[PDB]
């Protein structure tokens, strides 16, 4: 059979932003992230949620490479409390809806990371773990070759936007 | 083997680990270079084609340069990315980029969203040139690491 569900219309109106975030609209289009794409992300969410624990375990384990990062973690919270908010943020990424409320949250996390002194270069590198981790979740849960790229493309898109918004 | 960084860039060596870019991934990039070149013009002519979703970008270019000059560079830079061996010069090359990108006035957000158009281009070429799913992914991941590394370099 097939994995995703080809449904025209069950995709429309997934992007809902107002003047306050005029640019973001151009950004969503510059990465080919539209109604079709977001609806793809929504069909992946269940799949991501079911493996989020691993996703987040691999995540902090990967930062355990750069001592400083782990120090910044401890100085402000903890691995256990951070994993918790991370399982959440990552969830929302596949919500399939992009609106003002979705941007502004990014702005907040962007501000929080700056204050605590997280260097931007260590931020991008964090995503390379997420994407790789998700690539494998897909390749394993999605057998049809073509749909695997479909899913991989959608995520790289949403992840690019994450980086765009965090360091805007 | 394919990494000849001196202690001048000890942090970059940590970044390589963290993005999982080692001899293996680089060897994969080297092998992908031939493909990147017979398609480098379409890749780059596309890159510039997508910059219209935002007039400003196009305007930054026609002032501090020209489309043909930029392509000349891009084509050159993108190819190098698949050399398969990052050393000290490679790293400084990126510093040059950063420096300029700031002077001209390119916001980190547009710069970032630019790579997407590029990533998709490479992904397209592969899906049409690589039949074995494995080799498909193997090529994809490598390209996502070297790409991410750039973003890190031009944004430290
Ligand atoms: C690229 C993946 C990342 C994502 C998507 C992410 C996401 C988040 C989110 C959503 C919050 C909470 C915002 C809120 O409560 O309003 C947060 C907090 C935090 N993040 Fe990250 N983060 C990432 C990477 C990092 C890295 C690499 C570090 C490690 C240095 C880090 C350290 C922290 C810390 C310490 C806090 C909590 C600060 C406090 O309690 O005052 N984050 N992150
Ligand atoms: C995929 C991301 C991009 C890459 C890989 C990239 C790469 C480069 C490189 C290698 C150079 C030459 C640096 C040197 O002189 O040593 C450069 C120059 C430049 N880039 Fe970027 N760039 C990117 C995106 C952008 C975007 C989106 C714009 C804005 C429309 C832009 C505008 C320019 C301009 C105006 C120059 C100056 C060239 C000159 O001085 O004549 N770049 N870029």
UniProtKB/Swiss-Prot annotation, chain A:
Heme-containing signal transducer responsible for aerotaxis, the migratory response toward or away from oxygen. Belongs to the methyl-accepting chemotaxis (MCP) protein family. Homotetramer. This is Heme-based aerotactic transducer HemAT. The gene is hemAT. The chain holds residues 11 to 178 of 432 of the full protein.
């Amino acid at each position: 059979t097939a994995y995703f569900s080809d449904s025209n219309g069950q995709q429309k109106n997934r992007i809902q932003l107002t003047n306050k975030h005029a640019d973001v609209k151009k950004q969503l289009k510059m990465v080919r992230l539209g109604d079709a794409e977001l609806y793809v992300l929504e069909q992946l969410q269940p799949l991501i949620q079911e493996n989020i624990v691993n996703i987040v375990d691999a995540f902090y384990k990967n930062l355990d490479h750069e001592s400083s990062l782990m120090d910044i973690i401890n100085d402000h919270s903890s691995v256990d409390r951070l994993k918790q908010t991370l399982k959440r943020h990552i969830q929302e990424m596949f919500a399939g809806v992009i609106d003002d409320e979705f941007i502004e949250k990014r702005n907040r996390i962007a501000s929080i990371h700056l204050r605590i002194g997280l260097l931007p270069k260590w931020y991008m590198g964090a995503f390379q773990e997420l994407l790789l981790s998700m690539i494998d979740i897909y390749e394993a849960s999605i057998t049809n070759q073509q749909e695997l790229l479909k899913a991989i493309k959608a995520t790289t898109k949403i992840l690019n936007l994450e980086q765009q918004l965090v360091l805007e």
